[PDB]
Each structure stands twice: as C-alpha cells, then as structure tokens.
Amino acid sequence: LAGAAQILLKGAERLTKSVAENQENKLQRDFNSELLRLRQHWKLRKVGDKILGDLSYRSAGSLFPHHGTFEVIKNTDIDLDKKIPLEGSAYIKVSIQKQAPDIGDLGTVNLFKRPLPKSKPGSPHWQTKLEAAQNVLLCKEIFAQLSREAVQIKSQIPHIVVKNQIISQPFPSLQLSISLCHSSDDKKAAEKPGQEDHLYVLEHNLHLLIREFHKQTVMPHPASAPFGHKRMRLSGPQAFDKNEINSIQSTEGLLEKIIKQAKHIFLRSRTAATIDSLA
Amino acid sequence: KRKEEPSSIFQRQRVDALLIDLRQKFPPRFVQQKS
C-alpha cells in the first residue's frame, strides 16, 4: 500500500504540478495557448504533414501556387512562441525623372534596403514576418502582372521593359519603372529623394489589382441559377449598342496607370500657369 | 547547430546531370595511401 501510494503521488506530482503553469496564470507556453491564437486569427487547419492554411492569396490570386512550411519549434528562453518558419521584404517606389538610357549605376535601393518603420509597438513578431511575406508575394504578383505589357497592346504608348525595369516614356517629360527589392541579402546619397512621387500614387496601383480580382471573382443570382455575370445577363433586356457590349469589359493594368500618372503631371503643367500668372 | 537541415532546391537540380560529365572527361585517380 505504501509503494502504491508513493507511485500514485509521484504520478500526481508529475501530472498536476508541472502542467499547472497556465492553470494559475497565463504564462509563456506554446501548449494550448499559442497555436490556437494564430489559428483563429489567420487561417484554418489542414494536414499535408503539419501545414495548415498558408497565406498565399489563393482565394483570388489565380497566378501561382505556394505552400507553407509552418511548424512549432523549441528553444530555452523566456516568453518565446512557436516562431513558425521569398522570406524577405519588398518596397514599391516610382520616380518621375527626366530620362535615362540603358545603363546601370547606384539606382535601386542600396544595402540600406527599404528603410521602414522599426515597429517598436508590441505585436507578434512571427505575425509581422508572416504579413511581410504576404506583402512581398503581393509585390511579386503585381510585378508579374505589370510585366505582361510587352505582349500587350503596343499602340500609342511605346515602352521598353526588362527585369525589374519597366521604364516608359508616355510624354517626354516624366519617367517610370516602379521597382522592387529583396531586403533579405544583408546580414548586417542625394539621388534617392526626388520630386513628389511617393506613397499616395502607388497605393492606387496596388489596390487596382485586388479590385480587378473582386470585379472578376459577387454571387451571380441573375434569376435562379444560369450562373453568369450581372451586366452580361442583364444585357438581353435592352438592345445595347456594340459600344456597350464592348464596354461590358475593359482593359486594366499599366494602361490605367499609363493615363493616371500622365494626368497627374498634366495638372502640374497647369500648376505652372498659376505661378506664370505672377510672371 | 545545422546538421539535419537539407535545403532542397530542385529548380537547378539539373546540375547533378552535369555532374556526370566531369569523371567522363577525366576520372579521379585512386590512391590507397592514407598518409
């Protein structure tokens, strides 16, 4: 009886005393406290081996597939999560300069790749890495879409295009070639700053992609279930002209920006008029 | 601290096919002398 009592007491000490950490106060423990957090917050469960809900925009991407090698790990420390494992960072920047030939110099971001917010406010670092990966994949996708311009409608807008450089000349006043970098290849002057060509232009270009996704993703619901497009099905009730039939769809991508930025600098010309008044 | 992580590539894995092109141009010479 004494031996059985000692064995049961040892078992109870091993079970209910070394596992009562999170029962008294929520402390650092990946067990039943971290995995469900990120699960409920970001994705769902799936089992290839232990891969559950990789962030690849597969919901509306339709560009290229990518899996996620996400797995918990152990390490001796204090307040350490699972730290699940492109892997880099990207930056979108456009510059309307005068002109440029087919040359190479201290152009795109140097070793100081994409100076960005330190993000000192407390947030899950693994989640920051995850959203950064999502961002860089979005940059990859938008660049892959934008690259499809050489085989596009080559009329009224001639333009040269190479890897990472899409330098274009809509008017002989402005410049182009939005670029990107990979801030992962780094273990440890006065040309970078230019005219106003900053965040509040590129955001439109970025949003245009997800908007084109959305527009060609709304339930059909025309009457019961012919399963078609709203405007396409609603065309029948009215003898629309061939113009409207063509206007059912439209172009997208560079073309839009090809006008937009131009429009911008056009206003700039009018701006001169203002000060020209004083002159 | 890194003895099990084998970074697979399989994109340029074609290199292994090129691997069987050096011993054919010139093979290694056996020594049997572990000096």
Binding site: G48, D49, P65, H67 | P6, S8, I9, F10, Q13, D16, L19, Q32, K34
Partner: peptide, 19 residues
Amino acid sequence: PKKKDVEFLPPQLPNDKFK
C-alpha cells in the same frame, strides 16, 4: 583505403513538399 566503390546515392536530396 577510404572507398572501393562508385557512389552517387548518399546525397539523396529529399522533397518533403507534397501538396
């Protein structure tokens, strides 16, 4: 006397990327 054979299998780079 290190080896008396012809070896190419030891590399055996795995895939472990089943989708």
